[PDB]
Design a protein around this ligand. Sequence first.
Ligand SMILES: [Cl-]
Ligand SMILES: [Cl-]
Ligand SMILES: [Mg+2]
Length: 263
Amino acid sequence: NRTLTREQVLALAEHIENAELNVHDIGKVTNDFPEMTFADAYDVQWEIRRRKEARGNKIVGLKMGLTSWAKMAQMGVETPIYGFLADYFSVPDGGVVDCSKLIHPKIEAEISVVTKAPLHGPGCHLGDVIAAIDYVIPTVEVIDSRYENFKFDPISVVADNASSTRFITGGRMASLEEVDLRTLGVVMEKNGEVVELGAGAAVLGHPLSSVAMLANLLAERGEHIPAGTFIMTGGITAAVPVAPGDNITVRYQGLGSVSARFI
Ligand SMILES: [Cl-]
Ligand SMILES: [Cl-]
Ligand SMILES: [Mg+2]
């Protein structure tokens, strides 16, 4: 189920990460390696993780992509995808994002959770996740595909760490008792303009299910979700471009707001 040699994985991971580190967009790697499988792409992504860990970055969480059934079908995929978060991805609520360090960033409103118990697959589901949640926390992701290409290419995107680049936690944390995630309304404003609306159920029908899918995806590689893991469950709103000078504020129903300033 793999077509990349070890040397190719290592080279691809270096190439792709270099696009992020040097803020330089590249051609999607599936154009040069069309035989690349998702397993290949995850091999590349996890090698990027190791590259970051090797230079001392902490891996501080995981994020989900393609958490819309409709988008999955249109991307021809059967499950979401995931990526990892590095420490330097983190932006404090109200904080600054330096667009000169990014290629073509977009933001999306999400709900993250931190688990208090381990989750594993296969066959993990909502019941398991619900019992394992410590708290939830409003989070806006800044995603930035390192590819110059227009059309989404899920295998390339996976290899590019699911386009992860920054995340902004904010608003108020709550326990699952205090929030109904399916009906959790989200309003994204950019420069004062309401640009996107969404409700938590836009993530699979239930945002917490994304965490179960994450556990099941991880199980395929003999991995699981340790207790204490921070997971961004997926895009509640469509992704919205941001540019220097933009200020954004995402309002979470009953959970305050997340904001960020782009320069
Ligand atoms: Cl090794
Ligand atoms: Cl930054
Ligand atoms: Mg995201």
